[PDB]
């Protein structure tokens, strides 16, 4: 049986404060007794600006019932810092919230604030936790954004070693080996190899990256993630499309990877993004009529869901 807080000796000094909705609010929610009672006492705690262990316990009760309650999370973090609580213990509590499927923008942001304030000399333990947490959802957007933030923040402090960057690419390569269609892991590869400020740009690194992209396309020719990464790569580094055309032309029906002599089964031709590559390489050669003819086929035969877009591109050729 539930015991109301008005009947708890530890709370006898506190006068609860009711929610001030007005007399007949729209979108009212039928709250459980436990949740209303806890919020009635939270309003009083926050009114008197009490920073205490009982206030800390109360915030945990509330965010277990509603993990998206940003006001109570904000109050909880100020309780932790005011009381100089163990932030490593709090991080262990957040590990449980993930386990019991308590999640939101607010919980993820709480974890970031903890890491920021702990400011570990080496964040390797948190990196490994984040990697393991991707097991039930390898495309969790919050998790990938948090991983980006963690490496960016701690690299700004000089705390990501060359060995650490190297094993992060190793982990990224394995993620794409298990599912080459994971566009989140492709985005992470872009950070690791291209956009992060410490990335190497040399003729070797450009050659290596192009080899990995082309091998990935030859493994899964219909994988949009690989085509988009190829197009972004070439564009970002101002590299011509034409010299690579030998590897792309077999999909539109020399040193760098070529398609399998017989193509993999279940690979119907043409691949529409291969045709887009061909049209753009025609434009690079100033062969606008040839480009227009390819756009026209994309519009009327091969990618008809985008008939209007491909017609727009066709008309731009004139």
């Amino acid at each position: 049986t539930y015991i109301p807080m008005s009947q708890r000796r530890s709370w006898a000094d506190v006068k609860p404060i009711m929610q001030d909705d007005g007399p007949n609010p729209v979108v009212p929610i039928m709250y459980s007794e436990e949740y209303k009672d806890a919020m009635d006492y939270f309003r009083a705690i926050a009114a008197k600006e009490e920073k205490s262990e009982r206030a800390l316990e109360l915030t945990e009760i509330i965010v277990r019932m509603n993990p998206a309650h940003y006001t109570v999370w904000q109050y909880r973090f100020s309780l932790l810092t005011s009381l100089n609580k163990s932030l490593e213990d709090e991080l262990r509590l957040m590990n449980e919230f993930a386990v019991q499927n308590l999640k939101s923008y607010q919980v993820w942001h709480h974890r970031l604030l903890l890491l920021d304030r702990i400011s570990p000399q080496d964040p390797v333990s948190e990196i490994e936790y984040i990697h393991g947490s991707l097991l039930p959802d390898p495309k969790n957007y919050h998790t990938w954004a948090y991983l980006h933030w963690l490496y960016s923040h701690f690299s700004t402090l000089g705390r990501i070693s060359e060995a650490q960057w190297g094993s992060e690419l190793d982990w990224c390569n394995e993620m794409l080996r298990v599912d080459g269609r994971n566009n989140s892991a492709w985005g992470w590869r872009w950070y690791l190899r291209v956009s992060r400020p410490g990335a190497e740009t040399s003729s070797r690194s450009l050659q290596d990256e192009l080899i990995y992209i082309l091998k990935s396309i030859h493994l899964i020719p219909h994988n949009v993630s690989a085509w988009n990464y190829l197009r972004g790569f070439l564009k970002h580094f101002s590299l011509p499309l034409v010299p690579i055309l030998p590897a792309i032309l077999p999909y539109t029906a020399f040193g760098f990877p070529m398609p399998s002599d017989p193509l993999p089964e279940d690979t119907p031709l043409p691949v529409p993004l291969a045709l887009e590559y061909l049209a753009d390489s025609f434009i690079e050669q100033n062969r606008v009529d040839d480009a227009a003819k390819v756009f026209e086929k994309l519009s009327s035969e091969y990618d008809q869901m985008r008939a209007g877009y491909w017609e727009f591109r066709r008309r731009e050729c004139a």
Partner: protein
């Protein structure tokens, strides 16, 4: 008008090929293709003159959807507690959907909406997700409350707009407390930083005439650095210090953050500051937008990111971003000196056939088959359906006519900036800013003759506005109130 918008029923439906390379992504894609294509198979083609016997009729079940939303004005069950910090969104999703569906609220119910929202307004500035004695202000409930007051309020003494006007300085001060030096904003005290906050803040600042130079500094750079190599936008960018030496996008391109980024950047192009806003790659954003429309076997709905599943709410996020991307491309084509840009027919077919709750049930619209309908997917499906039905464009001649009628001698008191040099330089510059921002905010039109109503005129819903996502007949008197025009 449908030459380049083929119906899903007229195209060959075929699965995403496997290349003999199975993966978890492909397992889910194939299962979703089966769900959606089977429902299309049981449903009569909306484009037929007489509906087929034995098959489901796809007409928009407007009265079912109205009844679904009606719970908002009585009570929500106890499992709504997860949205207890989002109650202004429950209001907005309800009252904007009713506007789209053409259903009027009586004055007593509108007055309850206004009164409820004003209890969420805190005296120090901004709306929270619930009562001000319970929740701190937040940028996202502030947008939802402001737009809801545009839909349900009025200019009288009980209409709420008068209270908003009196709160302009405190809301501005809340916005400046949220501001980061790099151009991001926290969504609330101690809250996260992303382009949802930027979008919500810029909409409200535009509508209430509280934009200043100090408010906008670096905001364009934060947003522009969110663009990824795919052409869409991520949630945020990270500033690396020597202001920052460079900024890097923090996650993958996503339909919701791409909408927020395109809309934010579009609102900034109205602001007459020198070399502002920093440009984006509009062509790449348009390309990314159109590539997210699904194949015929998935009903022509939009996905929110590459290699994930279609979902009706991206009809608004991605589809509603298309006219903005199109306008930015047009401006750049003009600067360097006609068919629809996505399949407007197929998106409507997805909405009617796949996103409606099955008939004779709760009503409402949903993510996809197999998912319960909710208020958020009801609003976003209908907002995206509106964009597909009505051809929206930003009209330079309309903006020009707006400039010609603006009265700069009318307006509310100028906001007092936080820092001494943070305001406009003089009245000539401030009034020029007010004129440009007002005149462009009112520049969206529906093109005469561009209407496409799949399934017949009984499926027509009202026209929403790109960027703001409220009806033009709400936007115009609301923004005119705060700028003291007509």
């Amino acid at each position: 008008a449908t030459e380049f918008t083929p119906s899903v029923y007229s195209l060959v439906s075929k699965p995403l090929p496997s290349n003999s390379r199975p993966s978890a992504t492909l397992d889910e894609q194939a299962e979703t293709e089966d769900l959606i294509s089977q429902l299309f198979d049981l449903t009569a083609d909306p484009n037929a003159l007489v509906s087929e016997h034995g098959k489901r009729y796809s007409g928009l079940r407007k009265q079912e959807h109205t009844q679904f939303l009606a719970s908002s004005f009585f009570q929500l069950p106890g499992k709504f507690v997860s949205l207890d910090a989002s109650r202004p969104w429950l209001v907005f999703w309800t009252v904007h959907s009713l506007d789209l569906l053409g259903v009027a609220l009586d004055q007593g119910t509108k007055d309850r909406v206004v009164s409820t929202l004003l209890h969420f307004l805190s005296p120090k500035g901004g709306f929270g997700g619930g009562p001000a004695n319970s929740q701190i202000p937040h940028l996202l409930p502030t947008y939802a409350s402001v737009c809801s007051l545009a839909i349900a309020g009025n200019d009288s003494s009980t209409g709420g707009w008068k209270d908003l006007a009196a709160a302009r300085q405190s809301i501005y001060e809340f916005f400046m407390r949220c501001k980061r030096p790099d151009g991001g904003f926290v969504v609330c005290e101690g809250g996260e930083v992303d382009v949802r906050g930027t979008y919500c803040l810029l909409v409200v600042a535009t509508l209430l005439d509280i934009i200043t130079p100090e408010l906008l500094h670096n905001v364009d750079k934060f947003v522009s650095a969110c663009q990824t190599y795919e052409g869409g936008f991520a949630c945020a960018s990270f500033p690396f210090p020597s202001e920052p030496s460079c900024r890097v996008s923090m996650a993958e391109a996503h339909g919701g953050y791409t909408s927020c980024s395109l809309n934010s950047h579009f609102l900034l192009t109205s602001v007459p500051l020198p070399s502002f806003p920093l440009s984006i790659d509009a062509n790449a954003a348009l390309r990314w937008t159109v590539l997210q429309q699904g194949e015929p076997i998935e009903g022509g709905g939009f996905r929110g990111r590459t290699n994930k599943l279609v979902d009706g709410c991206y009809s608004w996020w991605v589809g509603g971003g298309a006219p903005v991307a199109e306008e930015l491309v047009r401006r750049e084509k003009s600067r360097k000196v006609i068919p629809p840009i996505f399949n407007r027919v197929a998106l409507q077919e997805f909405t009617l056939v796949a996103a409606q709750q099955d008939p004779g049930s709760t009503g409402g619209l949903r993510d996809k088959p197999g998912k319960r309908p909710d208020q958020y997917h009801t609003c976003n499906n209908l907002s995206g359906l509106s964009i597909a039905q009505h051809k929206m464009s930003h009209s330079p001649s309309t903006v020009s006519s707006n400039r010609l009628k603006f009265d700069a001698s009318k307006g509310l008191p100028a906001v007092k900036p936080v820092a001494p040099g943070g305001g406009w330089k003089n009245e000539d510059e401030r009034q020029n800013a007010r004129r440009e921002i007002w005149a462009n905010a009112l520049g969206w039109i529906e093109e005469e003759g561009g209407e496409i109503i799949v399934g017949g005129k009984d499926n027509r819903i009202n026209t929403t506005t790109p960027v703001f996502n409220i009806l033009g007949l709400r936007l115009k008197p609301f923004i005119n109130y705060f700028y003291c025009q007509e």
